[PDB]
């Protein structure tokens, strides 16, 4: 449809397949392949039970990669039921991905910075760590080892003195594996993406089933001023070829039209003549051409249910 949609979908596909398990790929791809998708229809497509679909939806909703829309449906055969639809709000998901990527990178950066700092001593018996500054005030009279204030036991130097290089590799590994996300985000920022809604998402619907019980339509209540949190987002050309005969007819019609107007515009009798002496106002060539044609032909031969509707 549009280049923007393809790149956004690719970013969503990459994130799910890499940072999530397997079933999450199935769930999100189903609602990306289709528009807003009913819960019942989603279960039939993936052939998974409610107990298995629930955990996937909940985790995806937490990260705001999928949005929920509940509305009442009125089928004539059965009583009114509440249906749940799942779709994707690109502005929400993209913002969530950007925040998480920054947080993950920052956390590794902070861990690398923290690791480069001197280690803090820890007490084995009570497992209460002490920083270098805090351990310096625990020195004993003989000044041999730091003694725990509680246990009164020598302190043991903590690990992580050798990990100074491992974390650098981890950050290098992540930035290489996470490169596609950054590249896709750069293009997204360059353009501007419209926020989707249940009604808007329905414009690209590919029905999953033939007789799905869920009526995939948005019929908002009339004049309903109620608002739910996060419920809204920001001629004919006729041609006329005029043949030579038609032009003659048009002239004839013009003459007839002029005659009709002239008769209607005729002055009344009382205005035509000055009425002063009247009483009180109270109360055959065809053979000629054929013989020529025959002669010229001889010359050539010689020489040679009821529902309201409107008309659109």
């Amino acid at each position: 449809d549009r280049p923007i949609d393809d790149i956004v979908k690719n970013l969503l596909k990459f994130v799910v397949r890499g940072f999530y398990g397997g079933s999450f790929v199935l769930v999100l791809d189903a609602i990306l392949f289709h528009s807003v998708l009913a819960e019942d229809d989603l279960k039939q497509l993936l052939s998974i039970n409610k107990t298995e679909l629930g955990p996937l939806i909940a985790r995806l909703r937490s990260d705001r990669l999928i949005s929920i829309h509940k509305q009442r449906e009125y089928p004539p055969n059965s009583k009114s039921v509440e249906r749940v639809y799942y779709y994707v709000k690109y502005p929400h998901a993209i913002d969530a991905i950007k925040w998480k990527v920054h947080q993950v990178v920052q956390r590794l950066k902070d861990d690398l910075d923290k690791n480069s700092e001197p280690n803090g001593y820890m007490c084995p018996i009570c497992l209460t760590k002490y920083t270098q500054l805090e351990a310096v005030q625990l020195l004993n009279f003989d000044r041999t080892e730091f003694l725990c204030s509680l246990c009164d036991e020598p302190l043991v130097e903590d690990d992580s003195g050798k990990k100074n290089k491992e974390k650098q590799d981890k950050l290098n590994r992540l930035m290489d594996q996470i490169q596609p996300i950054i590249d896709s985000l750069k293009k997204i920022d360059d353009s501007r993406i419209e926020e989707n809604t249940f009604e808007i998402a329905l414009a690209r619907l590919i029905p999953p089933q033939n007789q799905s019980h869920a009526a995939y339509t948005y019929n908002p209540k009339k004049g309903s001023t109620m608002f739910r949190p996060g419920d809204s987002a920001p001629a004919t050309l006729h041609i006329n070829i005029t043949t030579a005969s038609d032009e003659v007819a048009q002239r004839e019609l013009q003459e007839r039209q002029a005659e009709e107007k002239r008769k209607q515009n005729a002055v009344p009798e009382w205005h035509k003549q000055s009425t002063i002496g009247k009483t009180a106002l109270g109360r055959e060539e065809r053979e000629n051409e054929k013989t020529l044609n025959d002669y010229y032909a001889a010359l050539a031969k010689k020489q040679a249910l009821e529902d309201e509707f409107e008309d659109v």
Binding site: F309, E310, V312
Partner: protein, 58 residues
């Protein structure tokens, strides 16, 4: 080309065949898609009507 009024919750659309005239009635899910299909259909039907009118001229 019969289309339900925009003031009704239904999004149904019917095409009636020229003569028990053939009727093909379809229900849409989004009004935006319904309008887009309606405009394209109207152009084809209107153009064919003009072509038929021209043919009937002579």
């Amino acid at each position: 080309l019969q289309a339900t009024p925009a003031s009704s919750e239904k999004m149904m659309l019917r095409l009636i065949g020229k003569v028990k005239p053939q009727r093909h009635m379809f229900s849409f899910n989004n009004r935006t898609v319904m309008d887009n299909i309606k405009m394209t259909l109207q152009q084809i039907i209107s153009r064919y009507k003009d072509a038929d009118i021209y043919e009937e001229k002579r």
